[PDB]
Design a protein around this ligand. Sequence first.
Ligand SMILES: *[C@@H](C(=O)O)[C@H](O)C(=O)N[C@@H](CC(C)C)C(=O)NCCCCNC(N)=[NH2+]
Length: 218
Amino acid sequence: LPSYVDWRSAGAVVDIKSQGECGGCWAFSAIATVEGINKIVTGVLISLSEQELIDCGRTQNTRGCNGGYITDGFQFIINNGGINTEENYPYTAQDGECNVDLQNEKYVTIDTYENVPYNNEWALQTAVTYQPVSVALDAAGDAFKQYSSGIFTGPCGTAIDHAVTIVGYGTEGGIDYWIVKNSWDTTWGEEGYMRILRNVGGAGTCGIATMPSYPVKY
Ligand SMILES: *[C@@H](C(=O)O)[C@H](O)C(=O)N[C@@H](CC(C)C)C(=O)NCCCCNC(N)=[NH2+]
């Protein structure tokens, strides 16, 4: 595997987005990795609609701004036969009525998704080498919420509550890290991104390695 991977150097990461007060992080994470794999196999980076997942993708315990699961975001794109763009179905940070004309207008498709073996940072590094991967972490603490710069080491638990996207990894000064794309605008962290301690064992720092998944497009 490479010593460093950064999907932003390959044109596979859309600029930082802002979810606001709506609890739609599951939709932001699912969309960022579908944007990623679409660029890798089709060669064109298109920004996609989180709002379509929030409005049209309600199922079981995925309930729009009320929270949900990354994999239900991928399963909506699979069952719908595709997803529309951010410009065609823009984000309102609201639970809204599914716009059926916009739901039927599809520009990007995926075929299936896979789960990375949980609590296995080596298998997670292998998957990130091929594409951005969706993860969730424990973002309930003030240290996480107030993060500004550096390689974050904690404190944080592992009972995850906030989905984000890993867009790379590297090492600086002998310290290994993951590069994380968050959805709290460019005013949080390193212009919207976080570097977080890698190779710590088990579930990873703030549980980042405990439930990774990614979309598959043949
Ligand atoms: C994350 C955010 O917007 O900050 C958002 O709260 C969220 O969806 N969190 C997920 C985190 C991982 C995907 C596990 C979460 O905790 N989902 C569980 C939501 C259950 C909702 N069920 C009901 N009944 N509202």
